[PDB]
Amino acid sequence: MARRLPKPTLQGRLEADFPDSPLLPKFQELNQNNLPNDVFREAQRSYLVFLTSQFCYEEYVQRTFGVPRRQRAIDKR
Amino acid sequence: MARRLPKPTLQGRLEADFPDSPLLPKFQELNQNNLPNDVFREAQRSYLVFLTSQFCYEEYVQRTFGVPRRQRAIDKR
Amino acid sequence: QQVNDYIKAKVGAQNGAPGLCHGQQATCEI
Amino acid sequence: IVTPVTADVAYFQKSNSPRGRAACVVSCENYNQEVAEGLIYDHSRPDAAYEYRSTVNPWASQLGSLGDIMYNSSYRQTAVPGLYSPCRAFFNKEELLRN
Amino acid sequence: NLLLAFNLQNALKVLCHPRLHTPAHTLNSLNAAPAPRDRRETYSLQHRRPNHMNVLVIVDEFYDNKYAAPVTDIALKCGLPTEDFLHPSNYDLLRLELHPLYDIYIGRDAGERARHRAVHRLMVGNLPTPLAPAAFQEARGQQFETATSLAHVVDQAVIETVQDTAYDTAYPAFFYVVEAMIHGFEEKFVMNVPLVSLCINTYWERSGRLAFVNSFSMIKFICRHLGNNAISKEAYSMYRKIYGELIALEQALMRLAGSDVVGDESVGQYVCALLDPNLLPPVAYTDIFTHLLTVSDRAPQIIIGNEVYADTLAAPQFIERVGNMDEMAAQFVALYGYRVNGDHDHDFRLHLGPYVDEGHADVLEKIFYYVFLPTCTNAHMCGLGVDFQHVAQTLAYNGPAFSHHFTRDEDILDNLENGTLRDLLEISDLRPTVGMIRDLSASFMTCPTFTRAVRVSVDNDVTQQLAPNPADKRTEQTVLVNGLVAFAFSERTRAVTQCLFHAIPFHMFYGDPRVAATMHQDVATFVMRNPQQRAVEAFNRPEQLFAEYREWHRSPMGKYAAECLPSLVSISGMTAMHIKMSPMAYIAQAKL
Amino acid sequence: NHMNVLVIVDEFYDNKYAAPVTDIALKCGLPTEDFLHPSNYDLLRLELH
Amino acid sequence: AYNGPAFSHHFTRDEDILDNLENGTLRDLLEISDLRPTVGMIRDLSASFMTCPTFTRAVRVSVDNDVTQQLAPNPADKRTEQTVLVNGLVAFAFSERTRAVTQCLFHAIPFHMFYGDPRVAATMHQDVATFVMRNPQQRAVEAFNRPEQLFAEYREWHRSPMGKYAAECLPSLVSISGMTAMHIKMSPMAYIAQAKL
Amino acid sequence: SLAHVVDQAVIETVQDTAYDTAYPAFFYVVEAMIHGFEEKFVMNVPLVSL
Amino acid sequence: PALSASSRALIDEFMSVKQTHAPIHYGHYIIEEVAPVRRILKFGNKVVF
């Protein structure tokens, strides 16, 4: 008996528009044998959101390390 | 020491990786013979601190000595 | 039990009085 | 007699004993040394002059307090004899008890 | 002819007797009387517990098609002045005020014989206004402050600034979005420091108001870390003084209670309601409940929807500990898949973070949430429920996230496609960088799924547990999990913001007809149908969320807060208005 | 016996379960008219000099 | 000393430190203050380690009282004692992030009535913090409990009433004169001096 | 007949330094490195000034 | 009790006006004589008895 939320207005077919991404190969395995097209698209947009969030967190992780000594040792000479 | 504050977070592999410094030939004298890897590395680290302190003081002493009048008299010729 | 005993200690709850400067004490009610 | 700085002015406005406690021993039953001592020297119970308080200057009221040390009779036993003391009549145990 | 004084303490020999604090004799002499009452009002008598975990359906069904709305008894008693009260043309209200401490009320006639129930009045301020008007408690708080030598850190300028924020209606909903996504974790706050830095800078430079004053968590984090170069300073002094005053109130409240103790515990628990541990703040993000069960000797029965909670041992079986984000580096995919494969309706398990003992006894959260906020804002606030998956979809599915071409540092608005985030950013008049939206979409991994509501039931102190019926030994309270309080919203704002948020009635200080009618269309219809509802006391909330009798803060506290003045004198009033009216509180009041 | 003070502090506050409150820290708590009251006689008993 | 730029000769004295500093206590220690000190200055600071003294300590001084106050039957009472901290420094309340960073370097000592402060000592100790959390009534400065080794309350010059007056009175120009005139000995000498003045 | 040299403003300044939660802890370090020596303080004048 | 006034001003006022004199001023107090022998006070030319 639960209402979810009204919905945000949003642009469609964004991933299929944008040509190049590491997300497309991992994204292709989003099967739909039962769900209708619009429910499938809600699920797809959610899946892209998750993939982008994973990429962004991994980006921050690679941001964490800082600078080691060896790189300044190499370049400063 | 019955208790001591935990070791402050520091980089690793300082002495060997980045530099080759005039301190190293004097630093190489000390040996690990009895001590385990950990305590040997810690004492090594303390001794490197002490050598750095000596070097900084010794350079500051000559920084303090001042400017000669004769070198400024040679400013002409 | 200890809350009751502490209230009893702070309130002054319980004789005779040795000497009475004015006279027969008159009880007061609130 | 020394005295706390928070003594109430109204207490000195009316005739009272300088001890800080009521010392009217005639009121208690006769020949009861325990009851008379409980009236004069106790602070487990408030004085008969003011129920809400126990003593205005406890430095003179209780046994062995400063005023008791100064002006108790036979407690000194070494002061020079021949000098009248106006406070002696108030702090002496035997004299308070003879009434 | 001796001038004798007669203070409170001298008479205390009759005030602390338990004969005074018992309603058994009152209830006997009342029940046996004939002519029962013929008006046994039923509204807000007791809480009703739901099966469905969702609160959105609760609020919808409660305000969907509403009509003539009843108003409680105490909300009527606190409206009359004293002289109009005592006049015998308002008699049915006098007839039910037999005892000063026990607020009594009559049930529904149908189903059984007439019976009356008395619930204890927990604090001084719940005493009705015609028996203790606002000015009396204002002066009493002034007297308390002069007693404890409390020195007000806060200046009136910072309170006027807080209030000018509270009546903004131009408030950026995006600062609210960020405030909602952080939900009180240190690591995510440190992830997004430049975001909130830019945010505070723009909100304090474009206008003379300061944002993020809503959640106590953001205040603590900004004072704790962004005291550095965070913004252009001038604004940091506000947060300095706010936290300083929050601590000074506890300085005073500790000075009120004596150094002496009952047993192992001190006596500070019993004298003021804020200092007591069994009180819970309305907004909870860490594991407070199980800690409360560990500390509470009196049975602290928790209710999550339909499911009860009474044991520390069931801690896994009802509460899902939200892991630290780094420890969850592996467990992200299962969590995300749970949203599509898991039925969040009637889940009956809670996603919460591990508890952190701040080292203050949580007094500061209660003091900010119960005294500072309702005073400085005249209590114009509500609770808010969010659907976090829509927030993620608005943030991550944006254009600049996907395109490997777009740089890390640019004005997103130039490359922004037409989408609701465009309207949000434009109304919030703040231009954010790409890195900040990347970090926000990154914070999605940890965030909970939806906002939840929980009931707490704590037995009173042993000093006031004397009562005829066990139900009256309980005291009920509502706690928000994974949610936030909100100021008044705008109408132009509630075009792109309704896509993400919904209104919640709350605790009396956080229940407001203006705000809830602002957010909900249906509550706006309800208020337009019945304008008398504009008051905070006469507002009707779903019994599934709010019970006017069985709460810590009754209606009169809210009524006073509605007319509360923003001076610090009223802050002292609301501070002192939290004394418990227990014998061991009467002793401490006598000492001072 | 040992001169290492960090161990001293940590040995004092490690698992402390009972906190004793000193005498004079009780008197400075009470105000004057409450101090003279005969409900508090333990402290006043020792105010002789 | 383990900074690297201070240790490495190749780098200049005048240049700022943060530009080549690594993840460690120094990065966060300067990120707390947002201060930009130069390499030469940090080298000269590290140079103080030549004569830098050992651990900070506590030493207890005990003197006899004045001849005007000597009279008492027990010889133990006529003395008063105090504790001096050697090579340490008094300190204000720490923030939480700054204590988490600094717990490598600094530790707390509540050792004197003016300086045994529960809200300052609460940050520097997790154990004392929890100890106060179990007993909030303890947080008053007059009733706070310090270790017997660091001081005993009766055998001390200052007392709990003076610290309590310090806790009550607000900072003001009258309060300085108050605390000044408060440090008057109780002896016939003070009676005569005050009878003059 | 004493005259104070201090305003209430400077007293408020000292009180405000006392209630500084964001007091830079590295300051203590500098003090700890001088630990009350004259010459050693003279060594570090340009950093105490900064 | 015997006549004690903590400043000259209260004693001047008490010599002038017997009834309405202030028994307690802001900071200075006065104790009026309540004794078995009433005594007539003569100050300058004004008399209180």
DSSP-derived secondary structure for G56-90: -EEEEEEEE--GGG---S-TTTTEEEEEEEES---
The whole-angstrom separation of Cα D44 and Cα D66 is 19
The whole-angstrom separation of Cα E184 and Cα E188 is 8
DSSP summary character for residue B64 = H
DSSP summary character for residue E496 = T
G25 has a chain B CB within 8 A of its CB = yes
The answer to whether E587 contacts C28, with C-beta atoms less than 8 Å apart, is no
Task: Spell out which residues of chain G touch residue E227, defining contact as CB-CB under 8 Å.
Answer: 95
Which residue, A45, A26, A49, is CA-closest to A37?
A45
Residues E353, E285: contact at Cβ < 8 Å? yes
Task: Write out the two tokens for E460.
Answer: 């009173």
Which of E14, E15, E463 has its CB closest to that of C3?
A: E463
The whole-angstrom separation of Cα D31 and Cα D37 is 11
Task: Write out the two tokens for G129.
Answer: 């913090």
Cα-flanking dihedrals φ and ψ of residue E459, to 5°?
A: -70, 150
- DSSP H or E segment with residue E63: helix E55-63
F2 has a chain G CB within 8 A of its CB = no
B65 has a chain G CB within 8 A of its CB = no
* Residue E382 CB contacts under 8 Å (≥ 6 apart), including other chains: E485, E486, E503, E504, E505, E506, E510, E511, E512, E515, E516, E519
Which of E54, E393, E441 has its CB closest to that of A2?
A: E54
The answer to whether C10 contacts F38, with C-beta atoms less than 8 Å apart, is no
SS3 content of chain D, % helix, strand, coil (to 5): 35, 0, 65
Q: Which amino acid is at E522?
A: D
- Which chains pack against C, by 3+ Cβ pairs within 8 A? D, E, F
DSSP summary character for residue D7 = -
Residues D2, D66: contact at Cβ < 8 Å? yes
Which of H5, H28, H38, H45 should be substituted to probe chain G, the one whose Cβ sees the most G Cβ atoms within 10 Å? H28
Nearest-5° Cα angle at B74, B72 to B76: 105
How far does the CA of residue A68 sit from the closest CA of chain G (Å)? Answer: 7
A73 has a chain B CB within 8 A of its CB = yes
Which residue, E360, E240, E353, is CA-closest to E287?
E353
DSSP summary character for residue E582 = -
How far does the CA of residue B70 sit from the closest CA of chain F (Å)? Answer: 55
SS3 content of chain C, % helix, strand, coil (to 5): 35, 0, 65
A62 has a chain G CB within 8 A of its CB = no
How far does the CA of residue B4 sit from the closest CA of chain F (Å)? Answer: 8
Residues facing G16 on adjacent strands: G38
How far does the CA of residue E265 sit from the closest CA of chain F (Å)? Answer: 10
Residues E514, E488: contact at Cβ < 8 Å? yes
Q: Closest residue of F to D6, CA-based?
A: F32
Instruction: Label residue E511 exposed, middle or buried (CB < 10 Å: 0-12, 13-18, 19+).
Output: buried
The answer to whether G25 contacts B9, with C-beta atoms less than 8 Å apart, is yes
CA E541, E545, E550, E551 torsion: positive or negative?
negative
How far does the CA of residue H31 sit from the closest CA of chain E (Å)? Answer: 21
CA E128, E132, E138, E143 torsion: positive or negative?
negative
Instruction: Label residue I8 exposed, middle or buried (CB < 10 Å: 0-12, 13-18, 19+).
Output: exposed
Task: Spell out which residues of chain B touch residue G51, defining contact as CB-CB under 8 Å.
Answer: none
Cα-flanking dihedrals φ and ψ of residue G86, to 5°?
A: -105, 125
Q: Which amino acid is at E459?
A: D
Q: Closest residue of G to A72, CA-based?
A: G20
Checking I35-41 for CB contacts under 8 A at 24+ apart, the result is I35/I1, I35/I2, I41/I15
E70 C-beta neighbours (distance < 10 Å), count:
12
Residues E577, E141: contact at Cβ < 8 Å? yes
Residues facing E308 on adjacent strands: E303
Task: Write out the two tokens for D49.
Answer: 């002059």
H15 has a chain G CB within 8 A of its CB = yes
DSSP summary character for residue D45 = S
Residues F29, E258: contact at Cβ < 8 Å? yes
**What resolution does the deposited structure have, in angstroms?**
4.0
Which residue, E95, E106, E101, is CA-closest to E120?
E101
- Which chains pack against I, by 3+ Cβ pairs within 8 A? D
Strands (E), E107-207: 116-120
Task: Spell out which residues of chain F touch residue D55, defining contact as CB-CB under 8 Å.
Answer: 36, 44
Residues E366, E272: contact at Cβ < 8 Å? no
The whole-angstrom separation of Cα I6 and Cα E273 is 47
DSSP summary character for residue G137 = G
Residues E500, E494: contact at Cβ < 8 Å? no
Cα-trace Rg, chain F: 17
SS3 per residue for G92-111: CCCCHHHHHHHCCCCCCCCC
**Chain B, 5-44: which have a CB under 8 Å from a chain F CB?**
5
* Residue I25 CB contacts under 8 Å (≥ 6 apart), including other chains: I7, I9, I10
Which of D24, D26, D27 should be substituted to probe chain C, the one whose Cβ sees the most C Cβ atoms within 10 Å? D27
The whole-angstrom separation of Cα E285 and Cα E485 is 13
Residues A8, E395: contact at Cβ < 8 Å? no
Q: Which residue has the tokens 């304090």?
A: E204
Which residue, E203, E523, E274, E476, is CA-closest to E382?
E523
Residues E379, E561: contact at Cβ < 8 Å? yes
The whole-angstrom separation of Cα E252 and Cα G138 is 14
G82 has a chain F CB within 8 A of its CB = no
Task: Spell out which residues of chain G touch residue H17, defining contact as CB-CB under 8 Å.
Answer: 92
The whole-angstrom separation of Cα E516 and Cα E504 is 7
Residues E218, E183: contact at Cβ < 8 Å? no
* Residue B6 CB contacts under 8 Å (≥ 6 apart), including other chains: G103, G104
Strands (E), E329-387: 350-352, 382-386
Residues facing I30 on adjacent strands: I5
Chain centroid to Cα F31, Å, comes to 17
Which of F28, F30, F32, F36 should be substituted to probe chain D, the one whose Cβ sees the most D Cβ atoms within 10 Å? F36
Nearest-5° Cα angle at A48, A47 to A51: 90
The answer to whether E13 contacts C12, with C-beta atoms less than 8 Å apart, is yes
The answer to whether A65 contacts G22, with C-beta atoms less than 8 Å apart, is no
Instruction: Label residue H23 exposed, middle or buried (CB < 10 Å: 0-12, 13-18, 19+).
Output: buried
SS3 content of chain G, % helix, strand, coil (to 5): 40, 10, 50
D6 has a chain I CB within 8 A of its CB = no
A66 has a chain G CB within 8 A of its CB = yes
- DSSP H or E segment with residue A43: helix A37-64
Task: Spell out which residues of chain D touch residue I29, defining contact as CB-CB under 8 Å.
Answer: 9
The answer to whether F48 contacts D64, with C-beta atoms less than 8 Å apart, is yes
The whole-angstrom separation of Cα E85 and Cα E79 is 9
Task: Spell out which residues of chain C touch residue F34, defining contact as CB-CB under 8 Å.
Answer: none
The answer to whether B1 contacts F4, with C-beta atoms less than 8 Å apart, is yes
CA atoms within 13 A on the CB side of E489: 29
Determination method here? cryo-EM
Contact flag for G and F (3+ C-beta pairs < 8 Å): yes
Task: Write out the two tokens for A53.
Answer: 């969030």
How far does the CA of residue E359 sit from the closest CA of chain F (Å)? Answer: 15
Q: Which chain F residues have any C-beta within 8 angstroms of a chain D C-beta? A: 32-33, 36-38, 41, 44-45, 47-49
How far does the CA of residue F25 sit from the closest CA of chain D (Å)? Answer: 19
Instruction: Label residue E578 exposed, middle or buried (CB < 10 Å: 0-12, 13-18, 19+).
Output: buried
Task: Spell out which residues of chain H touch residue E242, defining contact as CB-CB under 8 Å.
Answer: none
* Residue E414 CB contacts under 8 Å (≥ 6 apart), including other chains: none
Task: Write out the two tokens for F1.
Answer: 């016996």
- Which chains pack against B, by 3+ Cβ pairs within 8 A? A, F, G
Q: Closest residue of I to D10, CA-based?
A: I31
Strands G57-64 vs G79-86: parallel, antiparallel or unpaired: antiparallel
Which residue, E323, E282, E334, is CA-closest to E505?
E282
Task: Write out the two tokens for I40.
Answer: 């007539």
The whole-angstrom separation of Cα H33 and Cα E15 is 62
Residues E428, E174: contact at Cβ < 8 Å? yes
